[PDB]
Amino acid sequence: LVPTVDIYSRLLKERIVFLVGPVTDESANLVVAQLLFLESENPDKDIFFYINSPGGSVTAGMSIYDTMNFIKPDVSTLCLGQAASMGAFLLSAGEKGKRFALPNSRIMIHQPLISGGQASDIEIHARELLKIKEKLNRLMAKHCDRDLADLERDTDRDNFMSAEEAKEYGLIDQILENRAS
Amino acid sequence: VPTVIFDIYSRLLKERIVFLVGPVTDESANLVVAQLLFLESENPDKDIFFYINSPGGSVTAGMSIYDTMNFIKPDVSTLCLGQAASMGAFLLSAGEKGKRFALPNSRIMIHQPLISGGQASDIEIHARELLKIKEKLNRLMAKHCDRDLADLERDTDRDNFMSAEEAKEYGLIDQILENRAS
Amino acid sequence: LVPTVFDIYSRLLKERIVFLVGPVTDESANLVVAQLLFLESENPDKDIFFYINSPGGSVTAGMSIYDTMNFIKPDVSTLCLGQAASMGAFLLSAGEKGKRFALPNSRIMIHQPLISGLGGQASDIEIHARELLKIKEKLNRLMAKHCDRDLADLERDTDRDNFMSAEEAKEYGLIDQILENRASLRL
Amino acid sequence: VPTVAFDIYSRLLKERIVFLVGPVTDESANLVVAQLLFLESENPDKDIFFYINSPGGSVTAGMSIYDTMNFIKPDVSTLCLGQAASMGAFLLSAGEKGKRFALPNSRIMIHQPLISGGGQASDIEIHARELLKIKEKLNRLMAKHCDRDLADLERDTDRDNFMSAEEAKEYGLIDQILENRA
Amino acid sequence: FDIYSRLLKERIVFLVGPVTDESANLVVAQLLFLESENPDKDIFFYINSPGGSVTAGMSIYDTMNFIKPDVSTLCLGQAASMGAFLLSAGEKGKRFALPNSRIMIHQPLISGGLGGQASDIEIHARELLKIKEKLNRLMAKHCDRDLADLERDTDRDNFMSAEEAKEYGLIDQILENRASL
Amino acid sequence: DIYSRLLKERIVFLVGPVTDESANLVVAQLLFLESENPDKDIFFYINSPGGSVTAGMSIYDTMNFIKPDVSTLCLGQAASMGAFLLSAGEKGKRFALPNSRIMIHQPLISGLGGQASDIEIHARELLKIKEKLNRLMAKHCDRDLADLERDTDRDNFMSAEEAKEYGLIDQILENRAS
Amino acid sequence: LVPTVAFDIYSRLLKERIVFLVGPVTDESANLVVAQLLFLESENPDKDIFFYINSPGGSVTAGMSIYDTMNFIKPDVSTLCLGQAASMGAFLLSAGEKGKRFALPNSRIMIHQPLISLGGQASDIEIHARELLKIKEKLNRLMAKHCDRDLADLERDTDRDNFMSAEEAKEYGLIDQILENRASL
Amino acid sequence: LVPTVFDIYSRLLKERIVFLVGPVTDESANLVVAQLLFLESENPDKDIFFYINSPGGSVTAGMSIYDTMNFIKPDVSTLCLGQAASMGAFLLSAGEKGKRFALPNSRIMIHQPLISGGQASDIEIHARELLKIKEKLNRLMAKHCDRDLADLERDTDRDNFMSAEEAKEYGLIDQILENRASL
Amino acid sequence: LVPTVFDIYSRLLKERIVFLVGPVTDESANLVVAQLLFLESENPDKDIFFYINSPGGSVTAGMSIYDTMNFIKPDVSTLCLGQAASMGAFLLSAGEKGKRFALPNSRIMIHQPLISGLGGQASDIEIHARELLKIKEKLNRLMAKHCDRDLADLERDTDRDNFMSAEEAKEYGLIDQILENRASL
Amino acid sequence: LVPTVFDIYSRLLKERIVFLVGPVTDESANLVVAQLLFLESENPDKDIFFYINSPGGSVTAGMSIYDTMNFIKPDVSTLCLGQAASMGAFLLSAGEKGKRFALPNSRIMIHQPLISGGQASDIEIHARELLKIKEKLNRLMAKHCDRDLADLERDTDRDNFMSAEEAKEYGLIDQILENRASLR
């Protein structure tokens, strides 16, 4: 269904990587592979990471996040459509100064959720989920240059933000209307 | 259900026998509760004989039976036939001490609570409630069995099957009945 | 599936005992309503004993029970066995004050209204969301009255699932007394 | 279910005939138990006739019947009609010795316990050990019922073992084959 | 009373539809009841059945031979497989069919056979062949025929009219009305 | 294939429901064409019943972000988000074929569940979406917000001529001489 | 589904001697890893292989095919946990050449005893229960070896699901270093 | 997706490596047969390396592999990685004697045949065929393992799991290879 | 589900009316058989009124009714209300000659046997096909007798579904009279 | 799914090897037909090697292969590997006489036609046609096996399994090939 000249491989030659739809092990690892490839091609030029995602798996998302921070090139992020949950986490993780959103994109942040067995096992997994919640708040607070207490308050339930609101919050640096913004 | 000059379960209810058979649900538990209250109304001082063949089930449903057993005036004698596992074993052990029995090839099993959520805040709320249930049931079981809390904690960490003799050794029942001569 | 002695529930209905067991539906709630009206007709002056073991259910169905409990002349005493959660806890706390009881290992739980993500046009979602919040506010106000507490307490205490032991429910003001046996009644 | 002011099974319950038909479940087994207890209270001095046509089923449900047969005062005579397989054959062989019968074309089948339907290796170990304990107990009890050496039962239950009425009598599972009332 | 309980007062017992543990034991129960009511009067066993479980059918068969009353059989509609076996098992001289009844006999079949280790399949195949031999031997006795004839004539489905069943030895008479006796 | 060949003519199709996948494919093609030549018009042919609002906005913001003019053409139909994108084409370069149809309406949601607090949060966000889309649509159509609110309360079907009078498109093309 | 660069992106990274295990370990996904390991050894037995693991675990025998192949071939198999390495995934992570086992800073490890999602005669359940316990004992013995820890430690720490941060995994002995970025040699 | 270098499996085929992975079906077995014939055609004298990670499967499907292994001129060396169970273990044990290998943590399992309906006559026919297969497989397994048939009948009555070392002790394989210096 | 005036069908059985409604199955046919035997036991000389509204069904189930109607002493009068198709029309035509009726807007349909699902070996399919052809001929012969027609007539006229009005059914010989009300008799 | 060397099957087609694997369907049989015609076009005089591992399937699909085998100029040698059951056994037995082979542990099975409704008239028509099929298949098989028709009628009444040796004695194949030295 993807046109040829495929189109995503052609845009990859421009150092553009897309994350579209739910963050899964497969879709996240495909992003990781493209990031490693682009670094191999030129470790010094910026990579442009376009995000339209409702979120997904935390560990899948972390594999992208850690790869973004590991590789040498700056990873610029761009929100188009929406960046929610892990998508918003990855958006805010772009190189500071190079995190963008289009004017009508939507950001949403929230605490982790689950889609059990013995009480002992439920205890273990609840404790792990609470560590994830705590780690994500701390990393998000760092990304946004905000207090940990703010992130805890502001992710207790679904928190939708416009592009201007996400910029004020510290999740992105600039809103781009066109190539003059 | 066979009938007599009343169906067979109503007939045995005339002898103050109440059955708990199969999984403990809100409905099956409350039918037992209703029978216990009925028997107390009929005669508040005569023993009731509570026959249990159950794999367990809902904790709150079992607690409605348990608290009713302790609330009503008559002693509730318990008898394990077939099996008393999980909430079934809890109710077996809750019978009036001295009047908890098992038939010779009955089986007992005890274990910690099991279940089969959304936001982390809610999962935390329900995990903490589940752990309080786990502690409460161990504390109550230790009292029933005349044992230390630490013993019940180790012995319910995984499924713990017991023969009738072992359940007697454990303190969960008082006597094994082979016939009316024992 | 139900022993006769009249079956056992009809027999206890003669003792003026009514059960609410399991989820609260239109059918199970109206059956409670019918028993309440029947007992009032049998004797408008004698207490009724309403035994609740329920995880909750439909709010409008539970409200049909609530309004009937307050409408009829006899006092409706409530007793929690097993659990009274959500609409179950609301009905328990609605018993005649002084006559709300729980058994020692009962569990109470309160929370804000929950839905099974509405559907349709934004105008319709706005209408149903506004009604859902109104329901939430009304239930908090009624619960505040039942518990003899400030509205702000109930707003705080229902934001997420709030489990209570019998002791906690008594201290909250949701029940009056915990009964281990028939010697426990005081006051 | 025909009516004769009773249904047909309630009517034969007046002749002290109790049926076990189809799979043994908690529900079907406890119904048998209730009938055994009912008959005992009606007259503890008369035999009970326990007619078995069953492919087997739950071991613990079967033990609830077994232990009740041994507990109550009346002799429980057993009759195989059609078939008594697995727990059905166990109950058949558990009848009062001297009063265990089969009709001429009935068939018996015995075998070791099987499970139709998981977890951690620790939990699988616990349940496998319990299954072997059941297997050992059933071999010991079957050997006693049949007046045979334990090694005989271990060998002969390793896989499905079908027996004709005559073979079951020679094995010791029943006492006599009844062709008619003569 | 319902209609079947009322006809039970006339010592009429029906076997209708597949032979199962439940349907067969209900027949057994009625046969025992009727014997208890009067051990000397014939019982009239009306069969309209396509067959079913062999061991269930044997419980009826052995009960018919055990009780004191003669059990007269009547085929109405059809008596196939275990139904034809039971029809042929009524007291000799008192086995009847209505004129347009149909009988069918065949060797045993298993719905979904073969399941497990070769050892278990061997055990169950041998039991099935013993059942096959026993049914042929018993049927030959019912029909006053050779075991070899029953083996030949049941290898595949063998449909018989009432007159053919009478000639074969499965029934004694065809009754068009009460004067054909 | 046929679509890659027409992409060489700077023709991009949106056909069927707007999803994350179908919208981003459009985005990728728009970015590709800008990279091939940032100055030449792009021709965005729309035959769509609508779909996801955020997916549609990714197309919308990309149309406005890239340097080339994006001309739009309605063939068959442009409904809901499809009509939104049609009206977003470069002004003066928004077209419909003579028997195409337009339809506009307020946001819809399919289904889930949650606490009253969460439902309130999401209803408020849906109402903000509704107003933003009415405001943007009014700007595209050179009409008032109150007009768009009134005219999208329920499904509003428009012929090509009605859509031109409304301001959603500039011209109806029977052929290249229109 | 997969970008091209003449090669799909994964074939291209295989030219950098990078092999991925992503998602559940199955017979098919494990043998694909085995095939890439043998291919890279054939292409150059003198260069390290970089085995990137993001997996929740899966089949024990399929995982053992990877494990024994890693140990069989000449090249060092360096391992990297990205995302998570759970169960058989953590086993393979810890099996990388010692000194060359890595995790990214926010990856997570989880270890536990074998589980099954049994049926037949009691004899058969006994046979398979014994085989499952042998697997449990072997995996504890091998894991204790990878981690340079006492067997009793692994027996205690795998009784139930045991999650570890990257730092905890390093202290436990499952990995050697946590990699922040290319400050590397 | 299979990596490309040729795809990765074709590339390993050029080094005379053939895989049997997952259940033995008509389709998966014939693909192995086709590779064996191709490799014999490429060089009839050089060993073929048959890597087996399989839980077993169809008996006739396996026999087509077995008979091809015995038919072609090249020695077919076998290697168990992961597991060789049932028909998988049969083919593992069918490798050229002296060239049957296992990796150290692979496992073998052997057992009698199993199946996953009709007139008694037809069930009799199929039960007899199943018992002939059982006896034939026991006879061929006894030859592969250099053991008495009675040993094999006893040892396959139920699932019989073996470590690599037990499989070597049994006679099913020749050596366990930790690496190429294990030779 | 049935008004208990003791339900209405039990009440009409006191007037010696038996209904066949819907598909003829073993269970519904034997229920008819039992009522027929019951009414004969109550009084062997009084007419029985057999009201048929049926689309047909099982041939052997229908034959149990047919043979019982002919076996018992009472005349069995038949009445078609709504429709009598296939085995239903067969039973209608089987009523005591002179006492077979239809209501004015009743519908009759006759046709050859059909089978729902044959599946087995060619040998078994031959056996079952032959039995079906035997059934087809016997039913045509019996129907021809009821209608005072030839077997060849019935074979011709049942080859495909043959719908008949009440008047057409009377002309054919399937019924004796059409009753608008009792004055029709 | 299929290694390249050509994919592996196209590579073996270059050596005039054609496979029939798994159930015989319209699609699988016509692919065999297509290969047979292609090999004849490539060289009408050289043997074709038709390798069969099949449980059977559609009779009409199998007949399209059968008639194509007899129609083309090249001899079609057949080899049973694994099994040739029902239509598979029929096609195996249809190879050029003298050139029908089996591997030592192959299995052959033969039997009468099977069916996995409508008016009685329609059942009569299809029953008669099925019996015609049964008779025709027994007649052709008796010719292939150089045997009396009555033998085939007897020996296909129920599922009839044959070892390779039994199939050779039956006349279904000519030789059993242990390895490349087994040939005449």
Ligand SMILES: CCCCC[C@H](N)CC(=O)N[C@@H](CCCCC)CC(=O)NCC(=O)O
């Ligand atoms: C744990 C208990 C679960 C259910 C009760 C839960 N506490 C609160 C709740 O569900 N309130 C709804 C009424 C309950 C009936 C089923 C949804 C309100 C309503 O009427 N909504 C209609 C609309 O506005 O569309």
Ligand SMILES: CCCCC[C@H](N)CC(=O)N[C@@H](CCCCC)CC(=O)NCC(=O)O
């Ligand atoms: C056309 C239909 C007529 C069917 C009658 C058919 N001739 C005979 C028949 O049903 N025999 C089996 C009984 C059925 C039980 C299966 C659920 C015999 C049996 O139990 N053998 C041992 C075993 O099963 O293991």
Ligand SMILES: CCCCC[C@H](N)CC(=O)N[C@@H](CCCCC)CC(=O)NCC(=O)O
């Ligand atoms: C849609 C119109 C329905 C009318 C039914 C249709 N006229 C005829 C019909 O039902 N024939 C079979 C029903 C008899 C049931 C006995 C088990 C007869 C039969 O037994 N044939 C041989 C075979 O079954 O093999």
Ligand SMILES: CCCCC[C@H](N)CC(=O)N[C@@H](CCCCC)CC(=O)NCC(=O)O
């Ligand atoms: C183990 C069993 C497998 C072998 C099957 C067995 N040899 C015979 C077989 O399949 N015969 C049919 C042809 C196959 C068609 C498949 C869709 C007969 C037919 O063409 N009937 C049409 C009619 O008369 O209406």
